[PDB]
Design a protein around this ligand. Structure first.
Ligand code: HEM
Ligand SMILES: Cc1cc(N)nc(COC[C@H](N)[C@H](C)OCc2cc(C)cc(N)n2)c1
Ligand SMILES: [Cl-]
Length: 362
């Protein structure tokens, strides 16, 4: 039954993958090999070629991602060979370094061994590999509130944060057979951070804002042809709005709009003044300016929408169905200035893909 669902996913994925790779003729024999392997072992092992194309297809199928034009240049690092916590730590360190590439960010995924009996081999607790800690002590809020529960779990495990607004969470993951995860502090030399300044308004630096260079999503499951890669962190570069319209602006995150309004010299008193709107624009301008000034890759929402239009045209030229989730594709500032806003998208889930999974803490 679980075997049968594996077999059906496998058939469907190998046919589609080999067709795209111009290897349709090899499908029958590879399917035959896979069927026997599943028969004997209850599973099968992807070739390097299948794994790489599988991760790329998965990105291509990610409905919520505006960045999919560049799906075929994903850098796929195959770490199915790891067995120890030191090898895992060093793989994650290497992912950070190679993905960061001195600011010229490379879209990269590192793939650790997959689940077996739905038993995880490696379980990553971090939401992103680089993320800030969050604290609340009777009314007192410090850092990123979205990290509050992970931070509390790390501090159970013997870690202690400095209670700055920008403490870097350690890497935290658990190996099969261990009851408790392990944690390792990130080497600062690997982590690029960007101070946020504004191109025209000198006082903007009085806010002492910064953000990290690379978003490396580390808690989603990569599913390829029935195989469950629960531990497979991946990164791109940011779209500016993700930092300037959510991470630094949202009231449940860093909540900086009133402070922004003050430093850009407008009143924050009347809804009709559109002070939040103006503050959002200047903060988003600041974020783009700052990343560019420091040599760290970033894209603005207009350029990203333009790139996505090319992605839509490319799907159509290749005779592939396009899927998308309009609610995430539209940027959260000036959405109607993009073509995305003015059309609709089929939100069907197609595999391979990246999926949410339950968190081991909370
Ligand atoms: C190369 C630069 C990249 C840019 C600029 C980009 C941009 C985005 C943006 C703007 C979102 C929407 C987030 C939001 O509204 O809060 C998104 C979501 C997503 N992206 Fe991309 N992305 C990039 C690379 C990738 C890569 C390499 C992968 C996987 C290999 C990927 C997989 C996803 C997934 C799975 C989501 C939805 C996440 C969720 O549901 O929580 N992205 N990305
Ligand atoms: C409910 C909700 C809606 C919405 N639009 N966004 C969120 C939270 O999104 C937080 C981040 N922006 C997401 C997880 O990042 C996606 C992402 C992944 C990758 C690989 C690159 C990139 N630039 N951005 C939550
Ligand atoms: Cl983020």
């Amino acid at each position: 039954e679980e075997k049968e669902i594996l077999w059906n996913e496998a058939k469907a994925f190998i046919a589609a993958c080999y067709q795209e790779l111009g290897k349709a003729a090899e499908v029958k024999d590879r399917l035959a090999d896979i069927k026997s392997e599943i028969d004997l072992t209850g599973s099968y092992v992807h070739t390097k070629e299948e794994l790489e194309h599988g991760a790329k297809m998965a990105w291509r199928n990610s409905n919520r991602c505006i960045g999919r034009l560049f799906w075929n240049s994903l850098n796929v690092i195959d770490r199915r060979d790891v067995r120890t916590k030191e090898e895992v730590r060093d793989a994650l360190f290497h992912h950070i370094e190679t993905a960061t590439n001195n600011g010229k960010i490379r879209p990269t995924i590192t793939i650790f061994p997959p689940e077996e009996k739905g038993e995880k081999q490696v379980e990553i607790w971090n939401h992103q590999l680089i993320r800030y800690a969050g604290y609340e002590s009777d009314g007192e809020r410090i850092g990123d509130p979205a990290s509050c529960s992970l931070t509390a779990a790390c501090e159970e495990l013997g870690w202690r944060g400095e209670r700055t607004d920008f403490d870097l969470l350690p890497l935290i993951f658990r190996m099969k057979g261990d009851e408790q995860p392990v944690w390792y502090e990130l080497p600062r030399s690997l982590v690029i951070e960007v101070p946020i300044t504004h191109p025209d308004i000198e006082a903007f630096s009085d806010l002492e804002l910064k953000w990290y260079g690379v978003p490396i999503i580390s808690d989603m499951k990569l599913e390829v042809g029935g195989i469950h890669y629960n531990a497979a962190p991946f990164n791109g570069w940011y779209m500016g709005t993700e930092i300037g319209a959510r991470n630094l602006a949202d009231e449940k995150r860093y909540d900086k709009l009133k402070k922004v309004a003050s430093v850009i010299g407008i009143a924050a008193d009347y809804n009709t003044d559109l002070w939040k709107d103006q503050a959002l624009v200047e903060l988003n301008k600041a974020v783009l300016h700052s990343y560019k000034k420091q040599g760290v890759s970033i894209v603005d929402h207009h350029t990203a929408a333009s790139q996505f239009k090319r992605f839509e045209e490319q799907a159509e030229e290749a005779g592939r169905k396009l899927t998308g989730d309009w609610t995430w594709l539209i940027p959260p500032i000036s959405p109607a200035a993009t073509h995305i806003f003015h059309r609709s998208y089929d939100n069907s889930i197609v595999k391979p893909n990246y999926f949410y999974q339950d968190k081991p803490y909370e």
